[PDB]
């Protein structure tokens, strides 16, 4: 075992996991879902006496997992995880999944031209997931067409700001918590334009960070053995969190 | 949304 020494021994033997997903989306006007994947990895930050062996489990029968590298130290065979950590923090196992994806917000925008001086725009944002979870560091973000005088906005949740160098509306949530609803009206001015070309509509796009992952995995026990010293896995302290954050995640209209 | 929990559960 070149990845951990021998002599190592603490007082208070204590992991730490984190699973760290992003979730990756494009969705149609009209609600289908175009696309989608979450890529994740499992950290593990373990202080741990010995040279101890743990099994980590967790729901792959209850979720599935496309495909996946592990770390050197992994037991290739429920077929589930082996391992001797190394001391410190490393990265577990890194992994795919398509199927079956918690899609934690949904945009719903809505577009209204009003001859050739206006556009109004409604977008509402769903969340969807436990009423006792908080989403946080939340942006929607509402592209406007190059021909903009200027933009009013109303909103009744967060901040929102046009953005003129960016051509963008971007709304900013501090929080936000499950099975809600956020809405934002704009009014997007337009000065006049050529006629030929029409408005290159790019998505409305999103940022949130969620504690929980969206692939569904959830971690069921990693067990502690180390034979030779007098702890067994019921003294070691253990720690999950989950952190899915937006990767592309975009709602046409 | 970035803190532990402890213990693992199901």
Known sequence: ?253 | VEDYEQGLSG
């Open chain 1, 1 to 253: 075992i070149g990845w951990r020494r021998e002599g190592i021994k603490y007082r208070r033997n204590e992991l730490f996991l984190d699973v760290l997903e992003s979730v990756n989306l494009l969705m149609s006007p009209q609600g289908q879902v175009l696309s989608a994947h979450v890529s994740g990895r499992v950290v593990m930050k373990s202080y741990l006496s010995g040279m101890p062996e743990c099994k980590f489990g967790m729901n792959d029968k209850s979720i599935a997992i496309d495909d996946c590298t592990f770390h050197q130290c992994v037991r290739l065979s429920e077929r589930s995880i082996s391992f001797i950590p190394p001391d410190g923090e490393f990265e577990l196992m890194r992994y795919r999944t398509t199927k079956d994806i918690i899609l934690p917000f949904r945009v719903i925008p809505l577009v209204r031209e009003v001859g050739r001086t206006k556009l109004e725009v409604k977008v509402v944002i769903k969340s969807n997931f436990k009423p006792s979870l908080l989403a946080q560091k939340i942006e929607v973000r509402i592209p406007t067409p190059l021909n903009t005088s200027g933009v009013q906005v109303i909103c009744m949740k967060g901040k929102a700001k046009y953005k003129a160098s960016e051509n963008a509306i971007v709304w900013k949530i501090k929080r936000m918590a499950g099975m809600k609803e956020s809405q934002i009206s704009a009014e997007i001015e337009l000065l006049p334009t050529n006629d030929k070309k029409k408005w290159a509509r790019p998505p409305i796009s999103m940022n949130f960070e969620v504690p929980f992952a969206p692939s569904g995995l959830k971690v069921r026990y990693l067990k502690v053995f180390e034979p030779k010293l007098n702890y067994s896995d019921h003294d070691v302290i253990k720690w999950v969190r989950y952190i899915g954050r937006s990767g592309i995640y975009e709602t046409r209209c």
